Scaffold this active site. Structure first.
Site, PDB file in Angstrom:
ATOM      1  N   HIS B  21      46.152  32.125  39.563  1.00 50.01           N
ATOM      2  CA  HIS B  21      44.793  32.472  39.176  1.00 50.01           C
ATOM      3  C   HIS B  21      44.750  33.956  38.871  1.00 50.01           C
ATOM      4  O   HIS B  21      44.587  34.775  39.776  1.00 50.01           O
ATOM      5  CB  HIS B  21      43.715  32.089  40.229  1.00 50.01           C
ATOM      6  CG  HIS B  21      42.281  32.327  39.769  1.00 50.01           C
ATOM      7  ND1 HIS B  21      41.326  31.321  39.788  1.00 50.01           N
ATOM      8  CD2 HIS B  21      41.669  33.451  39.275  1.00 50.01           C
ATOM      9  CE1 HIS B  21      40.181  31.832  39.309  1.00 50.01           C
ATOM     10  NE2 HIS B  21      40.342  33.122  38.989  1.00 50.01           N
ATOM     11  N   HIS B  23      44.087  37.046  35.368  1.00 46.42           N
ATOM     12  CA  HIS B  23      43.461  37.287  34.079  1.00 46.42           C
ATOM     13  C   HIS B  23      44.077  38.514  33.465  1.00 46.42           C
ATOM     14  O   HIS B  23      44.372  39.470  34.176  1.00 46.42           O
ATOM     15  CB  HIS B  23      41.978  37.686  34.226  1.00 46.42           C
ATOM     16  CG  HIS B  23      41.118  36.661  34.918  1.00 46.42           C
ATOM     17  ND1 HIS B  23      40.552  35.582  34.212  1.00 46.42           N
ATOM     18  CD2 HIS B  23      40.756  36.565  36.239  1.00 46.42           C
ATOM     19  CE1 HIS B  23      39.861  34.877  35.123  1.00 46.42           C
ATOM     20  NE2 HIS B  23      39.956  35.437  36.344  1.00 46.42           N
ATOM     21  N   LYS B 135      39.785  25.230  33.363  1.00 41.68           N
ATOM     22  CA  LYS B 135      39.062  26.033  34.317  1.00 41.68           C
ATOM     23  C   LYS B 135      37.559  25.732  34.285  1.00 41.68           C
ATOM     24  O   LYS B 135      36.954  25.650  33.211  1.00 41.68           O
ATOM     25  CB  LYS B 135      39.338  27.519  34.028  1.00 41.68           C
ATOM     26  CG  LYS B 135      38.373  28.468  34.752  1.00 41.68           C
ATOM     27  CD  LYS B 135      38.647  28.537  36.253  1.00 41.68           C
ATOM     28  CE  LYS B 135      37.756  29.547  36.952  1.00 41.68           C
ATOM     29  NZ  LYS B 135      38.041  30.917  36.504  1.00 41.68           N
ATOM     30  N   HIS B 167      36.365  27.840  40.146  1.00 46.72           N
ATOM     31  CA  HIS B 167      35.787  29.033  40.697  1.00 46.72           C
ATOM     32  C   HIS B 167      34.704  28.479  41.639  1.00 46.72           C
ATOM     33  O   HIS B 167      33.981  27.572  41.257  1.00 46.72           O
ATOM     34  CB  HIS B 167      35.089  29.892  39.624  1.00 46.72           C
ATOM     35  CG  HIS B 167      34.259  31.036  40.182  1.00 46.72           C
ATOM     36  ND1 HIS B 167      34.650  32.381  40.048  1.00 46.72           N
ATOM     37  CD2 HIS B 167      33.070  31.008  40.859  1.00 46.72           C
ATOM     38  CE1 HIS B 167      33.711  33.120  40.638  1.00 46.72           C
ATOM     39  NE2 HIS B 167      32.751  32.320  41.129  1.00 46.72           N
ATOM     40  N   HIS B 196      39.056  30.539  45.042  1.00 48.14           N
ATOM     41  CA  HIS B 196      38.315  31.559  45.775  1.00 48.14           C
ATOM     42  C   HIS B 196      38.060  31.080  47.193  1.00 48.14           C
ATOM     43  O   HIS B 196      37.117  31.484  47.829  1.00 48.14           O
ATOM     44  CB  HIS B 196      36.996  31.889  45.061  1.00 48.14           C
ATOM     45  CG  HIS B 196      37.290  32.314  43.664  1.00 48.14           C
ATOM     46  ND1 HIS B 196      38.534  32.815  43.309  1.00 48.14           N
ATOM     47  CD2 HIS B 196      36.523  32.309  42.564  1.00 48.14           C
ATOM     48  CE1 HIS B 196      38.501  33.108  42.016  1.00 48.14           C
ATOM     49  NE2 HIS B 196      37.304  32.805  41.519  1.00 48.14           N
ATOM     50  N   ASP B 199      37.538  33.214  50.370  1.00 50.43           N
ATOM     51  CA  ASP B 199      36.287  33.945  50.435  1.00 50.43           C
ATOM     52  C   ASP B 199      35.472  33.478  51.644  1.00 50.43           C
ATOM     53  O   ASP B 199      34.432  34.032  51.961  1.00 50.43           O
ATOM     54  CB  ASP B 199      35.433  33.770  49.178  1.00 50.43           C
ATOM     55  CG  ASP B 199      35.841  34.629  47.995  1.00 50.43           C
ATOM     56  OD1 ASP B 199      35.306  34.559  46.917  1.00 50.43           O
ATOM     57  OD2 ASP B 199      36.788  35.484  48.247  1.00 50.43           O
ATOM     58  N   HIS B 220      41.990  35.524  46.447  1.00 53.27           N
ATOM     59  CA  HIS B 220      41.251  36.779  46.458  1.00 53.27           C
ATOM     60  C   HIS B 220      41.809  37.710  47.511  1.00 53.27           C
ATOM     61  O   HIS B 220      41.133  38.609  47.964  1.00 53.27           O
ATOM     62  CB  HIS B 220      39.787  36.477  46.821  1.00 53.27           C
ATOM     63  CG  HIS B 220      38.998  36.268  45.578  1.00 53.27           C
ATOM     64  ND1 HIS B 220      37.638  35.976  45.598  1.00 53.27           N
ATOM     65  CD2 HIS B 220      39.394  36.328  44.272  1.00 53.27           C
ATOM     66  CE1 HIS B 220      37.237  35.872  44.326  1.00 53.27           C
ATOM     67  NE2 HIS B 220      38.270  36.080  43.502  1.00 53.27           N
ATOM     68  N   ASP B 267      43.805  37.065  41.533  1.00 53.03           N
ATOM     69  CA  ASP B 267      42.582  37.108  40.758  1.00 53.03           C
ATOM     70  C   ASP B 267      42.433  38.533  40.235  1.00 53.03           C
ATOM     71  O   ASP B 267      41.350  39.133  40.256  1.00 53.03           O
ATOM     72  CB  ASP B 267      41.319  36.587  41.492  1.00 53.03           C
ATOM     73  CG  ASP B 267      40.120  36.340  40.583  1.00 53.03           C
ATOM     74  OD1 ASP B 267      38.986  36.387  40.979  1.00 53.03           O
ATOM     75  OD2 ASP B 267      40.375  36.050  39.327  1.00 53.03           O
TER      76      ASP B 267
HETATM   77  C1  TEN Z   1      36.967  37.422  35.273  1.00 54.06           C
HETATM   78  C2  TEN Z   1      36.133  36.967  36.459  1.00 54.06           C
HETATM   79  O1  TEN Z   1      35.337  37.980  37.045  1.00 54.06           O
HETATM   80  P1  TEN Z   1      34.779  37.425  38.416  1.00 54.06           P
HETATM   81  O2  TEN Z   1      34.796  35.944  38.434  1.00 54.06           O
HETATM   82  O3  TEN Z   1      35.700  38.030  39.557  1.00 54.06           O
HETATM   83  C3  TEN Z   1      36.294  39.217  39.040  1.00 54.06           C
HETATM   84  C4  TEN Z   1      37.774  39.476  39.372  1.00 54.06           C
HETATM   85  O4  TEN Z   1      33.312  37.970  38.622  1.00 54.06           O
HETATM   86  C5  TEN Z   1      32.974  38.906  37.601  1.00 54.06           C
HETATM   87  C6  TEN Z   1      31.467  39.001  37.325  1.00 54.06           C
HETATM   88 ZN    ZN Z   2      36.450  33.259  39.655  1.00 49.32          ZN
HETATM   89 ZN    ZN Z   3      39.234  34.603  38.118  1.00 45.06          ZN
END
Ligand code: TEN
Ligand code: ZN
Ligand code: ZN
Ligand code: TEN
Ligand code: PEL
Ligand code: PEL
Ligand code: ZN
Ligand code: ZN
Lengths: 330, 330
Positions: B21, B23, B135, B167, B196, B199, B220, B267
């Site tokens: 997970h 980006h 996703k 998520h 997540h 969390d 996370h 993440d």
């Molecule tokens: C790309 C996703 O951003 P989030 O889900 O968590 C950030 C690492 O929340 C952002 C508003």
């Molecule tokens: Zn997320």
């Molecule tokens: Zn994410």
């Protein structure tokens, strides 16, 4: 001296008969690239647009202002392709409509100004195509973010001379609120067009704004669900007022002495993904003339109602040239 | 037999150590193309990503799953460029997150299924790159649209064998609601990762889902605003629980016998436009190791706490291979 188009700059005199509020496609940022099949195909959409633009040109239209912003899924490359194939000038826009994603929604007025300046001065994306108008919107009382958008638009307008055009919930008199914000930023009313103004029957609201110097956009002329009350979705979108009723407001404004403040259009499109599926089919049934609706139907109608041909020409040629020409305040 | 990557298909054994997970960039549809300068430049963002991926590779990471969907502003071309330059495999995703534009929001479950199938079977945009995971997201009780999204994801998963990752607002136990929807569509829990999950401190909620066959994403780990309580924005995003506290949940799950259901990640990201300006600076200060955080810090930590090295390898190599491998239900 020159207006920026998707094919480059043109002289004011080259604009000719111009439709000030139109769209090639009503969609969302990234949508067209990600799901072209939603429209048959990218090719089919382009062909449809070219055919429509050629019919409009046949009717006398020389230029169209596509007011699709980033959030409306504006694809300048599509615009450039279609402008070339149809031989119709197309002015592109910057600004934000009412579907901004988080990356935009979280920005400050300063950042937003930079983004609008970017599209106007540097070019859109990596195309080098510069926007020639700034589009903004409200749908009733402005949200705090919408207020930032209007201020940033006023700031970019002030720095560049490019006009501002808006989307309003006319019945709610949004024009009043927009004007106040713009004025507070020092923008001159003559650089602003308050759109979707024919959506209301309240002439007192319209003449009041016109008296202040604002341009009044009567751009929903062919928008009507009469004969389709059966269809709730179409009805909610188009309303049940006749195109004749809307067209008459043009004459009413002229009669009141505001001929120089009026801008007319169709708010038409060739593709529409931001609404119910199949909405285009409904729309094409309602107005097969598409963008040629104004010259083919409205003009003659007005002439028949006693509006001088000369006045009509000033509204479709002169007013737009004056509005579109980048103008810095003294 | 093979997993689709941005550089093409790879064999399961080629995946190796995988972060499930992550980006490259957290943004919005069309944003990167329209305002690259928001990130310095497109080039600067790419270089930053390459540097980060190379450091992660140095630490043992072979593959990363970028879970950015269309609405997260996923740019597959960027992904392909960076994968090639860093020599790290990157799996792309389809699905929808929580910032869908109107053109998506107005679609039916049937249309959404077609769109997900498109990205998985035909390719993303016109790149020919196929998604390897779906996703989805909820942030508390699912909205009616979010319910459509989860059903469409289950349907695309069922037809293709591709896994689903989510998520969640863990503290709200969203996992329970997601599971119920997926099950109602006939999707097997083993094809789903509830993200997540670290969390929350509620182990009862986690073991309950694990008992049902779901994969639990503890992604996370390095997310923590400790030392920055000063900063409200950072605090709201990262929480005030320590990375050690989060890492210990991994051990807790192993101790309960669910080693085979656990997936770990960071993440992390190299660019982030969908939050307050300058959030990346804050994040980089918090976790300079970026994506190498898991292998460099978490692994040794767990080892020190008594977790066998073999178990750790099964979590970072084996589990992901099993999850990622497209699998049709009998
Ligand atoms: C790309 C996703 O951003 P989030 O889900 O968590 C950030 C690492 O929340 C952002 C508003
Ligand atoms: Zn997320
Ligand atoms: Zn994410
Ligand atoms: C492209 C703009 O669409 P609308 O503003 O009016 C449609 C012609 O409202 C669509 C939701
Ligand atoms: O050349 C046609 C432009 C135009 C047509 C009809 C009325 C006013 C202007
Ligand atoms: O080759 C390094 C992959 C790995 C490193 C440390 C612990 C488990 C797996
Ligand atoms: Zn509008
Ligand atoms: Zn419009």
């Amino acid at each position: 001296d020159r207006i920026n188009t998707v094919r480059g700059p043109i002289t004011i005199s080259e604009a000719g008969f111009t439709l000030t509020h139109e769209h090639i496609c009503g969609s969302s940022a990234g949508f067209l690239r990600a799901w072209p099949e939603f429209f048959g195909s990218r090719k089919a959409l382009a062909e449809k647009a070219v055919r429509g633009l050629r019919r409009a040109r046949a009717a006398g239209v020389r230029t169209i202002v596509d007011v699709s912003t980033f959030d409306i899924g504006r694809d300048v490359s599509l615009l450039a392709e279609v402008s070339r194939a149809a031989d119709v000038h197309i002015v592109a826009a910057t600004g934000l409509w009412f579907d901004p994603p988080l990356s935009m929604r979280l920005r400050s007025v300063e950042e937003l100004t930079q983004f609008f300046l970017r599209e106007i001065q540097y070019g859109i994306e990596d195309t080098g195509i510069r926007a020639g108008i700034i589009k903004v919107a409200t749908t009733g009382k402005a949200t705090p973010f919408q207020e930032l958008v209007l201020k940033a638009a006023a700031r970019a307008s002030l720095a560049t001379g490019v006009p501002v055009t808006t989307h309003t919930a006319a019945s709610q008199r949004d024009g009043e609120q927009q004007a106040a914000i713009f004025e507070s930023e020092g923008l001159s009313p003559s650089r602003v067009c308050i759109g979707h103004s024919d959506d209301t029957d309240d002439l007192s609201y319209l003449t009041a704004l016109a008296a202040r110097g604002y341009l009044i956009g009567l751009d929903h002329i062919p928008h009507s669900a009469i004969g389709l009350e059966d269809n709730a979705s179409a009805s909610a979108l188009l309303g049940i007022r006749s195109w004749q009723t809307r067209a008459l407001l043009i004459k009413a404004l002229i009669d009141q002495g505001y001929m120089k403040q009026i801008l007319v259009s169709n708010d038409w499109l060739f593709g529409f993904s931001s609404y119910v599926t199949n909405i285009m089919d409904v729309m094409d049934r309602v107005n097969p003339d598409g963008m040629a609706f104004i010259p083919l139907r409205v003009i003659p109608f007005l002439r028949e109602k006693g509006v001088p041909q000369e006045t009509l020409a000033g509204i479709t040629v002169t007013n737009p040239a004056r509005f579109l020409s980048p103008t810095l305040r003294a």
